C-alpha cells in the first residue's frame, strides 16, 4: 500500500509544519480520512514510517480519538449532537427527519455509501441547538423541510 502523490504531498507538508514530525499525527489522520472517506487499516503502517513512529503507537492514537473511523467509508459524515442541550431542544426530531429522508439511523451508512450518521458529544454550539455537521459545515436544525434543502447541497 502506497499513498497517491497528491495525498503524500499534503501529508509531508503537515509533517514539515511542526518542529518535530510526530506532532503532525492528528493533522495527517484528518487528511487521510478526508481523502478516503475513512481511515483504511492498511494506511497506518506507511503513515507510521513517515512519522518515524511504531505502528502500534499509531493504532492506539486512531483508537483514542473518536473523530476517526476505520470501519465505514462515507462521503458525507452527518455528525449529530446527542448531548444535554441538543437533547432538550430536539435531537430526536432531527434524527427522525434524517430517518425519513435518508432511511438510516445513527451509526449507519446509506447503501450508496454517500451519508453516514455519526452521534457525537457537544459540538460547542449549544445556543443553536439542535446542532449537526455535514463534514466541515455546521447548522442548526429547524425542520425536516429545512434539513432536506441543506442535504440537497451535497451531491
Amino acid at each position: 500500500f502506497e499513498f497517491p502523490e497528491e495525498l503524500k504531498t499534503k501529508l509531508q507538508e503537515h509533517i514539515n509544519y511542526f518542529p518535530k514530525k510526530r506532532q503532525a499525527i492528528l493533522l495527517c489522520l484528518h487528511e487521510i480520512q478526508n481523502y478516503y472517506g475513512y481511515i483504511p487499516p492498511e494506511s497506518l503502517k506507511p503513515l507510521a514510517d513517515m512519522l518515524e513512529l511504531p505502528l502500534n503507537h499509531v493504532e492506539g492514537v486512531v483508537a483514542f480519538y473518536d473523530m476517526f473511523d476505520r470501519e465505514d467509508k462515507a462521503k458525507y459524515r452527518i455528525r449529530v449532537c446527542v448531548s444535554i442541550v441538543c437533547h432538550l431542544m430536539g435531537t430526536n426530531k432531527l434524527l427522525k427527519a434524517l430517518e425519513n429522508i435518508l432511511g438510516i439511523k445513527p451509526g449507519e451508512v446509506t447503501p450508496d455509501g454517500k451519508f453516514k450518521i455519526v452521534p457525537v458529544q457537544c459540538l460547542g454550539a449549544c445556543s443553536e441547538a439542535p446542532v449537526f455537521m455535514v463534514n466541515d459545515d455546521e447548522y442548526k436544525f429547524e425542520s425536516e423541510v429545512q434539513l432536506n434543502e441543506i442535504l440537497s447541497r451535497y451531491t
Partner: protein
C-alpha cells in the same frame, strides 16, 4: 476566503471588551482590526521588559478563565523561575457541554487572540506558541491559520518582531474528538503526538510540560484579556466589575431561554439576571426548574438569586447556564450527563473508567424502567465512587451534577422507583 458554514451564535455585551467586535457574527480581518487600534497594545508591550508585563498582568488580578481560576500573573511568574526554552499554549479545546464562547472570539476576532498570544509569549520568553483547537471547530482552525499569515505579512510574527529582538512562530494544532484533551497535561500529551492521557501532578506544566520544558497553558479568553491589560493598565483594569473577580466575564446561555447566546457581563451579575434581564426570560414563560452549570453542577429554582462569581455561595464553574423548565424530565437530563462522562473518561484510572461506564449503563436501565433493586443500589454506589485514585478533575466531578439532582429533586427520582 471561503470558510465552512457556522451557525450565527447571538452575542451581547455591556462592557464592549472581548465582544467589542465578536458581537457581530463575521470574521474581522487585520485591516479592520488595525482600524480599531489593534496590535498597538503589542507595540507598547515590546517597549517594556518581559518582567514589567508579568508584573502588569499580576497586579491586574486577572484569573484564568478556563475553570480553575488560577491567577495568571503568578502562573507566568512560576514558569520564568525555571530556565528556558519555554513554551506558550492557547487552550482552545472547548468541549464541555453548554460552552460555545471561545469559538466566537476565534471565529470573529482572531487577531485579539493572536495579539494576546504574542504579548504573553514575549512575557515568558517563549519563541514558540501553540493553539490547540478541537477538531469539531474546523472553521476556527482555518480562520486562525489565515489570521496568522495576515499577522506575519504585517510583521507582527516571525523573527525580530518590529525591531524588538523577539522571535515568535504560532503553530496551530487540531484535536480529533476527546474532551479530556482540554485538561492541560493531556493537551500537551496530544501536542507531543500521543493519546490524550493526563499526567500525574505534580510536576505542573510550568516546571515540566511540552518536551519536559517550562510551559504555560492559558485559556483563549484569559489570553484575550491581555491586550486590554497592556492597553488600559493594571490599575484601571482591576476596577472592572467586583474586586474579588475583576475583568469581563463571558456567560454562555442555552436551553429554554428566548435569547440563547454569549453575554459579556460583570461577575457581580446574578443567575436570575442572566436568565431574565439579559437572556430574555424563559421559552413560553414556563417556570424555571433547574440550571445545569455545564456538566459540573445543578442549581434549583430556589437558588437563582446568587452571584455569578467564584464566591462560597457563588455559581462558580465557568458561568455556563443551561436552563431547564417545568416540563423537562431531569432524570432524562441526568442520563445525558452520565452519557457524556462515559464517552470522555480516558480510562487510565480504574474507578473513573469503570464508574463512568456503569453510571450511564445503570441510569439508562433506571430511565427505561428495567432496573432491578440491585441496579438502583448499585447506581448510588457507583455515583459516589468514581473519584478514588483519580489523577485529574474529570473523575472528581463525573457524579457531582447527578448527585445534586438526587438531593435537590428527590420527588422526581421516586417516580422512576
Amino acid at each position: 476566503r471561503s470558510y465552512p458554514a457556522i451557525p450565527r451564535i447571538y452575542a451581547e455585551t455591556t462592557l464592549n471588551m472581548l465582544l467589542k467586535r465578536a458581537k457581530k457574527p463575521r470574521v474581522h480581518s487585520i485591516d479592520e482590526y488595525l482600524k480599531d487600534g489593534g496590535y498597538q497594545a503589542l507595540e507598547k508591550a515590546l517597549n517594556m521588559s518581559p518582567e514589567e508585563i508579568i508584573d502588569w498582568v499580576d497586579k491586574s488580578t486577572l484569573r484564568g478563565r478556563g475553570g480553575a481560576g488560577f491567577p495568571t500573573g503568578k502562573k507566568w511568574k512560576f514558569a520564568v523561575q525555571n530556565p528556558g526554552p519555554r513554551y506558550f499554549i492557547c487552550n482552545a479545546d472547548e468541549s464541555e457541554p453548554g460552552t460555545f464562547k471561545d469559538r466566537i472570539i476565534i471565529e470573529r476576532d482572531p487577531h485579539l487572540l493572536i495579539e494576546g498570544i504574542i504579548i504573553s509569549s514575549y512575557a515568558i520568553g517563549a519563541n514558540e506558541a501553540y493553539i490547540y483547537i478541537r477538531g469539531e471547530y474546523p472553521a476556527g482552525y482555518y480562520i486562525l491559520r489565515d489570521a496568522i499569515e495576515e499577522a506575519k505579512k504585517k510583521g507582527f510574527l516571525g523573527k525580530n518582531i518590529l525591531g524588538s529582538g523577539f522571535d515568535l512562530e504560532i503553530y496551530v494544532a487540531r484535536g480529533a474528538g476527546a474532551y479530556i484533551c482540554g485538561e492541560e497535561t493531556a493537551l500537551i500529551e496530544s501536542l507531543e503526538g500521543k493519546r490524550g492521557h493526563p499526567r500525574l501532578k505534580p510536576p505542573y506544566p510550568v516546571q515540566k510540560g511540552l518536551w519536559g520544558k517550562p510551559t504555560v497553558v492559558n485559556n483563549v479568553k484569559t489570553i484575550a484579556n491581555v491586550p486590554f491589560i497592556i492597553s488600559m493598565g493594571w490599575e484601571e483594569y482591576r476596577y472592572i466589575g467586583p474586586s474579588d473577580y475583576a475583568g469581563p466575564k463571558l456567560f454562555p446561555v442555552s436551553g429554554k431561554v428566548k435569547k440563547p447566546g454569549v453575554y459579556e457581563l460583570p461577575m457581580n451579575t446574578t443567575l436570575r439576571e442572566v436568565i431574565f434581564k439579559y437572556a430574555g426570560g424563559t421559552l413560553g414563560n414556563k417556570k424555571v426548574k433547574a440550571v445545569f452549570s455545564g456538566a459540573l453542577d445543578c442549581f434549583s429554582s430556589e437558588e437563582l438569586d446568587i452571584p455569578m462569581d467564584y464566591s462560597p455561595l457563588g455559581f462558580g464553574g465557568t458561568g455556563t447556564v443551561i436552563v431547564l423548565t417545568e416540563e423537562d424530565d431531569i432524570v432524562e437530563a441526568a442520563l445525558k450527563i452520565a452519557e457524556f462522562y462515559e464517552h470522555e473518561t480516558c480510562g487510565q484510572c480504574t474507578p473513573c473508567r469503570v464508574g463512568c461506564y456503569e453510571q450511564a449503563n445503570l441510569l439508562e436501565k433506571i430511565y427505561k424502567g428495567e432496573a432491578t433493586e440491585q441496579d438502583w443500589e448499585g447506581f448510588d454506589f457507583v455515583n459516589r465512587n468514581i473519584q478514588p485514585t483519580s489523577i485529574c478533575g474529570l473523575g472528581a466531578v463525573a457524579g457531582r451534577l447527578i448527585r445534586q439532582t438526587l438531593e435537590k429533586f428527590p420527588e422526581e427520582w421516586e417516580k422512576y422507583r
